[PDB]
C-alpha cells in the first residue's frame, strides 16, 4: 500500500532472458507454423474465429520496440499463439501436434528462467 513494499525483485535482466528464449523458440524445428502471421486473405475463416492473431516475428517487433511493459505481457503472447493454434487446429494434425510440443518447450524455459 502507500509507502509500504515488498523488497524489489530485480527486472534489469528481463528483457534480454525473454529475447533469449525468443531465439530459441525461433529455432526450434517445430517452430514453422508459428514464424509469421497466419495469411488471413488466404486462410478461410481465420480472421473472423481468431479475434487476437499472434506469431513469433510479431513478438520480436514488440518486444524490440519496448511494446512489453513486463515478463508477464510478454508469455501472455507467447502463450496466445499457442491458444490460437488449439483453436483452429485439430490435436492430431502436424500444426495441432507442433503447437503442444512449442508451448512444453516454452513452459520449461520459463520456469527454469525465471521461478
Not at 22 to 49: C, I, Q, R, S
Not at 57 to 78: H, M
Amino acid at each position: 500500500s502507500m509507502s509500504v513494499k515488498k523488497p524489489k525483485r530485480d527486472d534489469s535482466k528481463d528483457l534480454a532472458l525473454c529475447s533469449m528464449i525468443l531465439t530459441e523458440m525461433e529455432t526450434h524445428e517445430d517452430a514453422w507454423p508459428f514464424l509469421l502471421p497466419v495469411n488471413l486473405k488466404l486462410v478461410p475463416g481465420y480472421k473472423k474465429v481468431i479475434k487476437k492473431p499472434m506469431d513469433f516475428s510479431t513478438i520480436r517487433e514488440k518486444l524490440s520496440s519496448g511494446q512489453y511493459p513486463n515478463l508477464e505481457t510478454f508469455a501472455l503472447d507467447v502463450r496466445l499463439v499457442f491458444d490460437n493454434c488449439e483453436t483452429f487446429n485439430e490435436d492430431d494434425s502436424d500444426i495441432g501436434r507442433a503447437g503442444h510440443n512449442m508451448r512444453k518447450y516454452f513452459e520449461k524455459k520459463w520456469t527454469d528462467t525465471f521461478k
